[PDB]
Design a binder for these strands. Structure first.
Ligand SMILES: Nc1nc(=O)n([C@H]2CS[C@@H](COP(=O)(O)OP(=O)(O)OP(=O)(O)O)O2)cc1F
Ligand SMILES: [Mg+2]
Lengths: 399, 553
DNA sequence: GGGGGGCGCCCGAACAGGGACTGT
DNA sequence: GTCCCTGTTCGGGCGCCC
């Protein structure tokens, strides 16, 4: 017997167009779907069902296994609606994909129509083939909820026996944290997997996640341009740290001078720059995580495989500010790096606050949509929007 | 006959009801066209006589077909369409001959009276009431799908897909391009065995009530299909006849751009920038527009292009997909996709202007993006690129654009005009270049403004402006400093606005003023553009703020 | 002459969202 | 707050197909 589920009041189902898929991805999707159809998990539907949700497929890691992924973001936003603080403090955390579990539960009949999706054909040889879910679909926020009761019964034994192991669930995902040596840990996880095989993304280390402080140049000679760049950067930071002062440094820029004129630092300005250096290394004050608000993630391309990001719910109230380094090579692919960055950040967010951020991506909309699923490896998908970042803010966070 | 396929359940939008609309009057020729059709359909159970228990009605008409010998019964269901539920359309695109692979044997079949072979939901039939005017007039309803109803295409396309599924699973290696009721059927059998599989498909369709008249059963090349002629090793588009007026309205312009667009899929070098500019502002279709000298000339070039003979080839998957792009000027690009040189699969153009201000490297990146997505639709994979841009050019652009940008695997092609960056901001301030502090102020009420600079060598200039804006004066000031500066100049601005535009290295703009600025940036040897926070007492931003502020703010 | 769905192309009308501005 | 500027979406023409 199914749990009755309804959309948020005054909200209709998703009507998102399927995007074009590669031949590889389509062959995989058709293979997976005909099998799911054999098992009753999905049913063919017609076009009288007005709803649609995009679908694609990822080939995880090195394998020859595709995993179907349904972009359920729209539906999740329209479905009716504590977190382990210790999970971020374990030396190892593994991420298990417990998606298959959901297929064991039937899905409320009157909700099924909202889980419609369509498989495209190469060169439009045929009209799209539409399907519908009969079990709990992976990717849906309703799935982990409804399966919660049953999920607790599964782990309960394993938890009792391993009270120093923290097990956390988010959507299709199981986070398992330990302070075990990396050997007993992997043996523990394989234990827990044996424990799950019975009842029908590695490896994280939240203990070495890094905060990226704002920092000020160090120099022997300062030019007018240097000081100007400094004063503007401190002006901005003083919105994040009210303690920042600019008066003495700005005094040196009195008059109207050549950008490359060297300007000797007075004693005052010398000190007020030292103070500022320390005011920058403090907790930002009055930053309370509010679960009822979305996490905003903001990313800047710093170049040379360097990407910076900040997570806040309100401007200048950063919950975390971080960096993401990558290969300074020839075969650099910005879009790939950027989607690896959003995945790292989403991951940190799930692990820290149990929530997904909304991303402000420093990429063209069209560029992003053309390529991001070639590099995706997560079972979830964060919200995002696109933004031509002021090249000013790029300079503020640089290292 | 009528398919024993199950109906698709439809319904009106909530709280709504069927159409009540007077039959408007018809030609005699059309009334007899209709009557002949309706007496036949009625005989076949495809329509039913109704009585006064049916309040509804919706006007019917007819048009000659491409056969010019047969009529097509149509129904202006625009009102019922409004009150009918939404469908999800299953037709995701248009198949393209360039995506076909060489097949040993080919057949093309058209289903006869397609829609009228598919049952309509019983519960819904009453809203399809119409009336043939004529002896008095007769009132019918539809038992099958009607032409002019918005649910009919998707329901047909979905039904056709159910019907072919079993034949497809049984015959995985017969390829069947299914567009409406049109079937391209290809195989690698000898023509003997092929013809036998065709018969099995035809029987299969006939068991589900879909006939395939020998009249529309093409057995020999060249096949007519989707607007093409498919020869065994090459394909062609059926002749494109351009209009030839001497006056041109918005409507026959729109008509000419369209035929040109259509043409560009296999005719290289088609251009329509100058022609589509005409369409700007113009309030109605009937409105006449005079061909600009440039549009005039463009239309000529296209006309010469269309005169040549051309063709495409089919896809060989054991080989690579290559896309070659060519710069065409005006934000216009052309591409040819191929596998073996000088044998195009297809061609295309890209001209979309997006952005107030842009440059050629951006536009090239948009072209690559569109082409990639189109290759994925047609061939299901990305092509390898040949682009007229040096690896060093792209590299520079990429390591200095603050955005993530990327092009798939490509290789450079010396065929001009090469794409380039037309100037480059310095990353460090310039020694021995004069320093300009620029600024602008505008009064929001009077719309009066001042723009101006102050330099470290003691020069100052203020220009007064009318009917202007803050952003505009900030841009005016930068322009002014470019005008009165040497080949090398340092400019300090407090405008994020202005800094964001120039820093992205535009070479084209909608803006007259930005274009003038760009002209200057190209003439310079070195420019370095720095930013400072406004109204923070930072000289000599301070100095120039006082100048342009006076009498404005 | 009057209808439908698909994709394409162009355009301009609504919006959304962020920066700059006012102030006896 | 307001005004300016830019970007998105979406609806409306035309092209092509059935
Ligand atoms: N202009 C059209 N409007 C349509 O709704 N259609 C639809 C309704 S009939 C279907 C198939 O087109 P077609 O020309 O084969 O019409 P059929 O009813 O199958 O006529 P034939 O017996 O094949 O001559 O597509 C076609 C058009 F050309
Ligand atoms: Mg037909």
């Amino acid at each position: 017997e199914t749990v009755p589920v309804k959309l948020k009041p005054g909200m209709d189902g998703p009507k998102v167009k399927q995007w074009p898929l590669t031949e590889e991805k389509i062959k995989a999707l058709v293979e997976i779907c005909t099998e799911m159809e054999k098992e009753g998990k999905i049913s063919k539907i017609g076009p009288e069902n007005p709803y649609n949700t995009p679908v694609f497929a990822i080939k995880k890691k090195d394998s020859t296994k595709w995993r179907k992924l349904v972009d359920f973001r729209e539906l999740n936003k329209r479905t009716q609606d504590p977190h382990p603080a210790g999970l971020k403090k374990k030396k190892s955390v593994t991420v298990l994909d417990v998606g298959d579990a959901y297929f064991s539960v039937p899905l409320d009949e009157d909700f099924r129509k909202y889980t419609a999706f369509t498989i495209p054909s190469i060169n439009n040889e045929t009209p799209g083939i539409r399907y519908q879910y009969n079990v709990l679909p992976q990717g849906w926020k309703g799935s982990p909820a409804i399966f919660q009761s049953s999920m607790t019964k599964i782990l309960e034994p394993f938890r009792k026996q391993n009270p120093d192991i923290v097990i956390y669930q988010y959507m299709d995902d199981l986070y398992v944290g330990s302070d075990l040596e990396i050997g007993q840990h992997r043996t523990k996880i394989e234990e827990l997997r044996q424990h799950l095989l019975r009842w029908g993304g590695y490896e994280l280390h939240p203990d070495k996640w890094t905060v990226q402080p704002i920092v000020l140049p160090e120099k022997d000679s300062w030019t007018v341009n240097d000081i100007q760049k400094l004063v503007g950067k401190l002006n901005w930071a003083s919105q994040i740290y009210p303690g920042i002062k600019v008066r003495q440094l700005s005094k040196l820029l009195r008059g109207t001078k050549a950008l490359t004129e060297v300007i000797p630092l007075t004693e005052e300005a010398e000190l007020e720059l030292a103070e500022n250096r320390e005011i920058l290394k403090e907790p930002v004050h009055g930053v309370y995580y509010d679960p009822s608000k979305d996490l905003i993630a903001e990313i800047q391309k710093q170049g040379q495989g360097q990407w910076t990001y900040q997570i806040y719910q309100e401007p200048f109230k950063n919950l975390k500010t971080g960096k993401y380094a990558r290969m300074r090579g020839a075969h650099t692919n910005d879009v790939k790096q950027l989607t690896e960055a959003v995945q790292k950040i989403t991951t940190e967010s799930i692990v820290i606050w149990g929530k997904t951020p909304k991303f402000k991506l420093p990429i063209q909309k069209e560029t992003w949509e053309t390529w991001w699923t070639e590099y995706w490896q997560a079972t979830w998908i964060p919200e995002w929007e696109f933004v031509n970042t002021p090249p000013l803010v790029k300079l503020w966070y640089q290292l | 006959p009528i398919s024993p396929i199950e109906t698709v359940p439809v319904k009106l939008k909530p709280g709504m009801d069927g159409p009540k609309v007077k039959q408007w009057p018809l030609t005699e020729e059309k009334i007899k066209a209709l009557v002949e059709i309706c007496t036949e359909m009625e005989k076949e159970g495809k329509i039913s006589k109704i009585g006064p228990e049916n309040p509804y009605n919706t006007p019917v008409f007819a048009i000659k077909k491409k056969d010019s010998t047969k009529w097509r019964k149509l129904v202006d269901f625009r009102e019922l369409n409004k009150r009918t539920q939404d469908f999800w359309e299953v037709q995701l695109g248009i198949p393209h001959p360039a995506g076909l692979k060489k097949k040993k044997s080919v057949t093309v079949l058209d289903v006869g009276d397609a829609y009228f072979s598919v049952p309509l939901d019983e519960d819904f039939r009453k809203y399809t009431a119409f009336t043939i005017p004529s002896t008095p007039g007769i009132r019918y309803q539809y038992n099958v799908l009607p032409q002019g109803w918005k649910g009919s295409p998707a329901i047909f396309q979905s039904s056709m897909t159910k019907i072919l599924e079993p034949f497809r699973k049984q015959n995985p290696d017969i390829v069947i391009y299914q567009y409406m009721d049109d079937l391209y059927v290809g195989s690698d059998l000898e023509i003997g065995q092929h013809r036998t599989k065709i018969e099995e498909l035809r029987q299969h369709l006939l068991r589900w009530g879909l006939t395939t008249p020998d009249k529309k059963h093409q057995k020999e090349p060249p096949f007519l299909w989707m607007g093409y002629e498919l020869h065994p090793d090459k394909w062609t588009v059926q002749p494109i006849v351009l209009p030839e007026k001497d006056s041109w309205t918005v409507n026959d312009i729109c008509k000419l751009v369209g035929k040109l667009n259509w043409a560009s899929q296999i005719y290289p070098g088609i251009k329509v920038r100058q022609l589509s500019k005409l369409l700007r502002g113009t309030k109605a279709l009937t409105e006449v527009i005079p061909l600009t000298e440039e549009a005039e000339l463009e239309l000529a070039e296209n006309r010469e292009i269309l005169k040549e003979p051309v063709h495409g080839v089919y896809y060989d998957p054991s080989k690579d997909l290559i896309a070659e792009i060519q710069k065409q000027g005006q934000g216009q690009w052309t591409y040819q996709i191929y596998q073996e040189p000088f044998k195009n699969l297809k061609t295309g153009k890209y001209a979309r202007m997006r952005g107030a201000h842009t440059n050629d490297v951006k536009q090239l990146t948009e072209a690559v993006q569109k082409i990639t997505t189109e290759s994925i639709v047609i061939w299901g994979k990305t092509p390898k690129f040949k682009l007229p841009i040096q690896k060093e050019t792209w590299e520079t652009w990429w390591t200095e654009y603050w955005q993530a940008t990327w092009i798939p695997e490509w290789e450079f092609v010396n065929t001009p005009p090469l794409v380039k960056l037309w100037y480059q901001l310095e990353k460090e301030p310039i020694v021995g270049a004069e320093t300009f502090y620029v600024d602008g102020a505008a009064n929001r009420e009077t719309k009066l403004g001042k723009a101006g600079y102050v330099t470290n060598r003691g020069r100052q200039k203020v220009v007064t402006l009318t009917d202007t804006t803050n952003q505009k004066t900030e841009l005016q000031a930068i322009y002014l400093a470019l005008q009165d500066s040497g080949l090398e100049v340092n400019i300090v601005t407090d405008s994020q606005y202005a800094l964001g535009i120039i820093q992205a290295q535009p070479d084209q703009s909608e803006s007259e003023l930005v274009n003038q600025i760009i002209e200057q940036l190209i003439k310079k040897e070195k420019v370095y553009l720095a930013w400072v926070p406004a109204h923070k007492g930072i000289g000599g931003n301070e100095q120039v703020d006082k100048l342009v502020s006076a009498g404005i703010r």
